Design a protein around this ligand. Structure first.
Ligand code: BCL
Ligand code: BCL
Ligand code: BCL
Ligand code: BCL
Ligand SMILES: CC[C@H]1c2cc3[nH]c4c(c3C)C(=O)[C@H](C(=O)OC)c4c3nc(cc4[nH]c(cc(n2)[C@@H]1C)c(C(C)=O)c4C)[C@@H](C)[C@@H]3CCC(=O)OC/C=C(\C)CCC[C@H](C)CCC[C@H](C)CCCC(C)C
Ligand SMILES: CC[C@H]1c2cc3[nH]c4c(c3C)C(=O)[C@H](C(=O)OC)c4c3nc(cc4[nH]c(cc(n2)[C@@H]1C)c(C(C)=O)c4C)[C@@H](C)[C@@H]3CCC(=O)OC/C=C(\C)CCC[C@H](C)CCC[C@H](C)CCCC(C)C
Ligand SMILES: COC1=C(OC)C(=O)C(C/C=C(\C)CC/C=C(\C)CC/C=C(\C)CC/C=C(\C)CC/C=C(\C)CC/C=C(\C)CCC=C(C)C)=C(C)C1=O
Ligand SMILES: COC(C)(C)C(=O)C/C=C(\C)CC/C=C(\C)CC/C=C(\C)CCCC/C(C)=C/CC[C@H](C)CC/C=C(\C)CCC=C(C)C
Ligand SMILES: CCCCCCCC/C=C\CCCCCCCC(=O)OC[C@H](O)CO
Ligand SMILES: CCCCCCCCCCCC[N+](C)(C)[O-]
Ligand SMILES: CCCCCCCCCCCC[N+](C)(C)[O-]
Ligand SMILES: CCCCCCCCCCCC[N+](C)(C)[O-]
Ligand SMILES: CCCCCCCCCCCC[N+](C)(C)[O-]
Ligand SMILES: CCCCCCCCCCCC[N+](C)(C)[O-]
Ligand SMILES: CCCCCCCCCCCC[N+](C)(C)[O-]
Ligand SMILES: CCCCCCCCCCCC[N+](C)(C)[O-]
Ligand SMILES: CCCCCCCCCCCC[N+](C)(C)[O-]
Ligand SMILES: [Cl-]
Ligand SMILES: [Fe+3]
Lengths: 281, 240, 300
């Protein structure tokens, strides 16, 4: 079925591969070549997940956990039950994530719109590969990657973090957090501002974008604009993820001690390093 | 059975209702779903259509009630390519001229968008007292080059979003003396020229024209922007 | 092609003094300078700003809070400017010890000052909330901003006021310090048996991640249809254009459903406010009802 306004947009063309072989829809979903690829990768990764659950001995989704190979395996292949499945599932996940992005690109072309959405999605993929590929490789073992389990992969975060004391002190970790908080702050303000203008007080006409500007100038003396806030929201969310991949690719690769020790270059500058008093004196 | 268990259970119930509510709110446009022949589709999903809400538009422009009887209010020059559903509908003539596909436009009101005071939101800079180029390259006077590396005209003015102090269109003078509007987001201002990758030089004349030299309506904006974006797909044969 | 991340050509005109409606124009400042810098990314105009009694009370009360923490840091630094800059992030204004309970009778150097600063912060935040309400009211707008702000205030009220009271000790509040308040966060989790296994904490994370997800989707979507004037979202609500249609159809073809130009902003506001809404609940239940979340988690 279609939206009342959808038909005039369902024209042929825009594909990158296969011409018109896969240029069709299944219900609302556009297929395309990479839609078929996505389905094939996804269907495989899911089967291997079910196969790992059989080897594990449980069909409870809260207990299923596919672990990577043991550190002793280095960066080599492992048997299916001893990390191999994690390795193949990681390949399928990557295939599905990348196929998903290229499918979005085919949809951008058929609709004559920009490629911002798949470009932003690639940052999320970058973060995933930072944890399962880039960092493990640089450290020299797949085992450093995280396990595919609902709760076991929270344990990995905890174990990895506390290996370096309090991960809070990772300076790149602070920056990424600041963007995450600021992003949610900006998202709440933006959604609230549009709704407040489209849904004003009772007995009032719809407000205008000028009211939005005026509200924020009255509140904090500056309005970024209707275009600027969407540029900002895109930037805040991508930077957050960017510094997240950054704060991990340096952990265990170029930094090995507790992150609180990184802040001593400031404390122990030879001039004020000895002045008695204070916290460090 | 402790207070924590009841809190997390109560929340999941609250969240289910919230999602239900959010989905129906996002069904005020484009529903009910239609078959590819325009008739109502049998399966409309589990979520019902929301109850109408009314916006009172400012400046006496009436009221909008959504959801309401939908209408394209324009001909669609497409045709089925398959008995079964889910296949492309092919243009029957010139898609850029017929405004289909990436060249589509919507039948918005043939009126200009207004600012908070009731004045035209967008205006040519020659009619905007006090506005000027404050940073970057001033495109006025520069030649406009199409994807065929030929010159279609020269920039003669900039249409400015006054409340937001933003350039939205370039007014380009064609070889024949007339002008067209080019979306600011589809041009590249360079040192010596303005490059438009979306259109070839001989497709600028095909851009829809406006009725008034000092205002542009919402309908004309959709027609102009649709045409230019449609060039990416339909002007590609002569893109060097 | 052109991506519309930074403005290509800035234009500037007579400053916008804004809508009047029922705003008391006596309390609006003059217009500030234009910033060509900010113009590359958004609007270049600075000001005017509204300065009423609440704003003055908030700004003043907020500067007292800032100055109170300040003089304490200078006192910990022994009044030495060098030691001040060296240990700036290590200084901390701690709440009263557990022995004082909920008494305001703690001497200044043992949590009395933390209570004074907390009073100023309390006045500054709540007077600023009233500010966000009246500014919307003066313009005839909805109060979505004030209600969304309440969600953040809720977590802030739980951390430093509501929960300490239910626990019966100001010592359960957070300290004022850059590093010290990070350490408080770390200990809070260890003491309560790992917050990873607090379901409201996991929910809070889902909405924090989901807010970065949703804003990257929405921001990328509006820029991708800005070639059709998609950022002018209010008029797209009153009069759907091809921008709103292409935006919806991209996502419908991608994942099977879509939003409207208005509906996407209800997704956005709820995604964000649920972060601090669920979080304030998780923190409130920690130590009051549940002592160990990992253990609690294994029984359910
Ligand atoms: C949620 C659990 C913890 C907590 C954990 C963290 C962590 C973890 C981090 C911060 C960070 C920061 N926190 Mg803290 N923080 C908490 C509560 C607070 C409160 C408060 C009113 O309760 C305040 C004012 C702050 C203030 C701050 C800033 C110093 C800094 C960046 C905030 C930000 O993104 O602002 C966005 C708003 C604007 C830019 C405006 N935190 C609670 C108690 N906070 C980061 C930092 O850099 O610390 C040094 C950081 O890494
Ligand atoms: C005890 C634990 C440690 C700690 C240790 C770590 C470690 C270790 C790491 C982090 C990381 C992060 N931490 Mg920390 N951290 C702690 C305390 C905090 C606090 C806090 C208030 O205390 C905060 C706010 C944060 C914040 C954060 C973020 C900056 C970051 C996670 C986001 C991210 O990168 O996403 C990135 C996004 C993704 C990976 C998503 C990718 C999605 C892919 C592309 C698509 C999936 C599709 C899906 C399967 C399909 C399903 C389809 C169905 C239809 C549904 N940490 C404490 C001190 N933290 C992580 C990080 O930076 O990672 C790079 C990380 O590894
Ligand atoms: C980002 C840094 C850390 C990390 C740290 C944390 C922490 C800390 C927490 C989570 C939480 C979650 N994480 Mg994790 N997580 C990481 C990597 C991942 C990846 C991945 C492919 O890289 C995925 C798919 C997940 C998935 C999930 C969900 C089970 C859950 C809620 C996320 C959410 O709503 O996000 C925002 C996204 C949306 C709102 C959109 C919808 C996404 C849905 C929910 C995805 C479901 C995926 C499904 C369960 C798994 C695949 C199914 C396949 C069919 C096999 N994590 C890395 C290693 N994650 C929380 C939780 O409750 O865990 C139990 C939690 O507390
Ligand atoms: C060792 C650390 C612990 C842990 C301990 C905690 C604790 C403790 C808390 C969190 C909380 C949070 N944690 Mg945790 N957290 C851990 C691991 C993680 C991981 C991870 C990858 O492992 C992630 C992604 C997170 C993520 C998060 C967020 C979902 C959540 C914060 C919500 C928020 O926006 O607060 C930021 C927003 C606020 C603090 C609101 C403040 C609003 C006030 C009104 C602002 C006033 C500012 C002032 C007046 C003005 C300043 C000057 C200005 C310029 C004007 N945590 C581990 C397990 N986490 C919080 C929560 O809710 O938990 C349920 C919390 O309290
Ligand atoms: C609800 C989800 C997020 C959120 C929302 C939020 N914050 C808000 C608002 C909203 C809706 C406001 O309206 C209010 C504001 O005026 O923003 C422009 C504010 C605000 N959020 C602020 C900060 C802030 N918010 C934070 C977090 C969050 N705010 C959440 C992540 C954080 C952290 C630590 O993450 C901080 C530091 C202020 C900039 C402002 C409150 C101003 C205030 O109270 O000032 C008084 C103090 C002095 C004048 C000094
Ligand atoms: C980059 C900024 C943020 C962001 C942005 C973002 N995400 C995006 C996009 C964008 C712009 C899309 O366009 C795209 C989309 O279509 O969203 C609806 C997407 C997307 N982001 C998603 C999820 C997601 N994003 C996240 C984060 C973020 N996304 C960032 C914070 C997170 C988390 C945890 O924070 C998650 C879980 C999806 C909903 C969607 C992409 C879906 C996709 O690629 O589908 C094809 C794949 C399948 C259908 C199935 C693949 C399954 C595998 C083969 C097997 C499973 C293996 C897996 C590793 C198991 C691990 C599970 C455990 C860890 C629990
Ligand atoms: C301004 O304009 C905007 C809109 O319109 C006007 C919007 O509509 C949206 C979209 C946003 C929403 C609808 C809000 C809700 C989304 C959320 C909470 C994100 C989280 C989303 C989800 C959890 C859903 C995830 C679902 C999927 C990934 C789909 C599952 C995948 C399947 C079934 C497979 C895909 C199909 C194929 C590969 C093709 C089939 C293959 C064959 C071989 C047959 C945005 C951003 C916007 O700015
Ligand atoms: C030259 O330098 C001078 C001295 C001038 C300075 O100004 C330097 C000053 C600074 C650099 C200040 C730096 C500031 C900080 C380090 C502050 C850091 C703050 C945080 C990390 C966040 C902590 C906030 C969390 C808490 C603990 C909030 C408590 C709020 C409560 C809800 C208030 C509760 C109220 C109470 C108990 C009583 C008051 C009255 C009531 C009616 C309740
Ligand atoms: C130069 C003066 C700077 C003073 C700044 C005070 C503190 C603000 C800080 C962070 C919040 C982020 C603000 C962005 C929120 C904008 C919400 C929104 O939707 O704005 C769009 C537009 O303004 C409607 O027309
Ligand atoms: C589809 C191309 C994506 C390639 C990246 C996938 C990363 C998988 C890492 C595991 C490699 C396992 N192997 C082959 C060494 O046995
Ligand atoms: C580091 C992540 C690598 C995966 C990227 C592949 C998916 C396609 C994303 C890019 C498409 C967008 N763009 C602008 C390049 O056309
Ligand atoms: C025993 C009940 C425990 C509380 C359950 C919490 C679920 C309801 C609260 C959701 C938030 C509601 N509100 C008013 C903020 O929109
Ligand atoms: C299936 C039970 C549903 C009841 C739980 C709460 C659902 C209502 C969701 C909030 C409504 C949003 N609103 C109207 C306040 O903006
Ligand atoms: C992260 C939670 C997201 C919940 C999404 C559930 C709502 C999808 C509704 C699909 C129905 C739309 N349809 C096909 C009838 O047009
Ligand atoms: C604490 C969570 C608050 C809910 C956030 C969403 C606000 C919806 C309520 C709209 C307000 C209506 N009104 C008439 C006051 O403008
Ligand atoms: C408004 C959007 C709704 C998004 C809902 C996302 C649900 C994520 C589930 C996280 C799992 C939480 N829990 C309780 C198992 O810890
Ligand atoms: C985690 C909740 C489930 C995520 C997927 C929800 C969206 C499913 C696809 C949209 C509905 C498709 N259909 C065929 C009913 O139109
Ligand atoms: Cl005020
Ligand atoms: Fe928006």
């Amino acid at each position: 079925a279609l939206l009342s306004f959808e038909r005039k947009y369902r024209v042929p063309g825009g594909t990158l591969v296969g011409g018109n072989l896969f240029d069709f829809w299944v219900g609302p979903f556009y297929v395309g070549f990479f839609g078929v690829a996505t389905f094939f990768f996804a269907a495989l990764g899911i089967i291997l997940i079910a196969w790992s659950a059989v080897l594990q001995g449980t069909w409870n989704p809260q207990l299923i956990s596919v672990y990577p190979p043991a550190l002793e395996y280095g960066l080599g292949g492992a048997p299916l039950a001893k990390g191999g499945l994690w390795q193949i599932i990681t390949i399928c996940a990557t295939g599905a994530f990348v196929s998903w992005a290229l499918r979005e690109v085919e949809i951008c072309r058929k609709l004559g719109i920009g490629y911002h959405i798949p470009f932003a999605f690639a940052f999320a993929i970058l973060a995933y590969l930072t944890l399962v590929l880039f960092r493990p490789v640089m450290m020299g073992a797949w085992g450093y990657a995280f396990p595919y389990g609902i709760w076991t992969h929270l344990d990995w975060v905890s174990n990895t973090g506390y290996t370096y004391g309090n991960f809070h002190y990772n300076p790149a970790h602070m920056i990424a957090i600041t963007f995450f908080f600021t992003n949610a702050l900006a998202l709440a303000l933006h959604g609230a501002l549009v709704l407040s203008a489209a849904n004003p007080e009772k007995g009032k006409e719809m407000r205008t974008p000028d009211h939005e500007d005026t509200f924020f100038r009255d509140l904090v003396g500056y309005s970024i604009g209707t275009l600027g806030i969407h540029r900002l929201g895109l930037l805040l969310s991508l930077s957050a993820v960017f510094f997240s991949a950054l704060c991990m690719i340096i952990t265990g690769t170029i930094w090995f001690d507790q992150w609180v020790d990184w802040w001593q270059w400031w404390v122990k500058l030879p001039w004020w390093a000895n002045i008695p008093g204070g916290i460090n004196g | 059975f402790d207070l924590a268990s009841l809190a997390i259970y109560s929340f999941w119930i609250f969240l289910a209702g919230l999602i239900y509510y959010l989905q129906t709110e996002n069904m005020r446009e484009g529903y009910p779903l239609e078959n590819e022949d325009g008739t109502p589709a049998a399966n409309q999903g589990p979520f019902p259509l929301p109850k109408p809400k009314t916006f009172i538009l400012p400046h006496g422009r009436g009221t909008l009630t959504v959801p309401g009887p939908e209408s394209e209010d324009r001909p669609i020059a497409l045709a089925r390519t398959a008995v079964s559903e889910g296949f492309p509908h092919a243009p029957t003539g010139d898609p850029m001229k017929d405004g289909v596909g990436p060249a589509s436009w919507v039948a918005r009101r043939d009126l200009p968008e207004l600012d908070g005071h009731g004045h035209n939101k967008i205006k040519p800079m020659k009619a905007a007292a006090g506005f000027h180029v404050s940073a970057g390259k001033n495109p006025i006077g520069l030649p406009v080059r199409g994807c065929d590396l030929e010159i279609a005209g020269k920039v003669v003015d900039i249409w400015v979003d006054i409340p937001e102090q933003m350039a939205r269109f370039l007014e380009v003078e064609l070889k024949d003396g007339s002008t067209r509007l080019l979306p600011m987001q589809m041009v590249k201002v360079q040192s010596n020229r303005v490059h438009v990758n979306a259109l070839s030089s001989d497709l600028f004349a095909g851009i829809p024209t406006i009725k008034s030299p000092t205002e542009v309506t919402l309908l004309e904006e959709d027609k102009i922007c649709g045409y230019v974006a449609g060039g990416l797909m339909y002007a590609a044969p002569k893109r060097k | 092609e052109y991506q519309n991340i930074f403005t290509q050509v800035q234009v500037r005109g007579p400053a916008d003094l804004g809508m009047t409606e029922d705003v008391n124009l006596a309390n609006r400042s003059g217009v500030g300078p234009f910033s060509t810098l900010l113009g590359w990314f958004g609007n270049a105009q600075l000001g005017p700003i509204y300065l009423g009694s609440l704003g003055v009370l908030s700004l003043f009360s907020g500067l007292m809070w800032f100055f109170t923490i300040g003089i304490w840091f200078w006192y910990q630094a022994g009044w030495n400017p060098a030691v001040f800059l060296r240990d700036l992030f290590f200084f901390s204004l701690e709440p009263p010890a557990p022995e004082y309970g909920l008494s305001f009778a703690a001497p200044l150097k043992e949590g009395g000052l933390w209570l004074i600063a907390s009073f100023f912060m309390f006045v500054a935040v709540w007077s600023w909330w009233g500010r966000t309400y009246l500014r919307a009211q003066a313009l005839g707008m909805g109060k979505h901003t004030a209600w969304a702000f309440l969600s953040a205030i809720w977590l802030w009220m739980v951390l430093g006021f509501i929960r300490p009271i239910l626990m019966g000790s100001w010592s359960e509040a957070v300290p004022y310090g850059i590093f010290s308040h990070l350490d408080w966060t770390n200990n809070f989790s260890l003491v309560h048996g790992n917050l990873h296994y607090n379901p409201f904490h996991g929910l809070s994370i889902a909405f924090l991640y989901g807010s970065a997800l949703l804003f990257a989707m929405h921001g990328a979507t509006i820029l991708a249809v800005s070639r059709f004037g998609g950022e002018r979202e209010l008029e797209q609500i009153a009069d759907r254009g091809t921008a709103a249609e292409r935006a919806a159809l991209f996502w419908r073809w991608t994942m099977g459903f879509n939003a409207t130009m208005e509906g996407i902003h209800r997704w956005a506001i709820w995604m964000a406010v649920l972060v601090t809404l669920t979080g304030g609940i998780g923190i409130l239940l920690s130590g009051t009802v549940v002592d160990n979340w990992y253990v609690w988690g294994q029984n359910h």
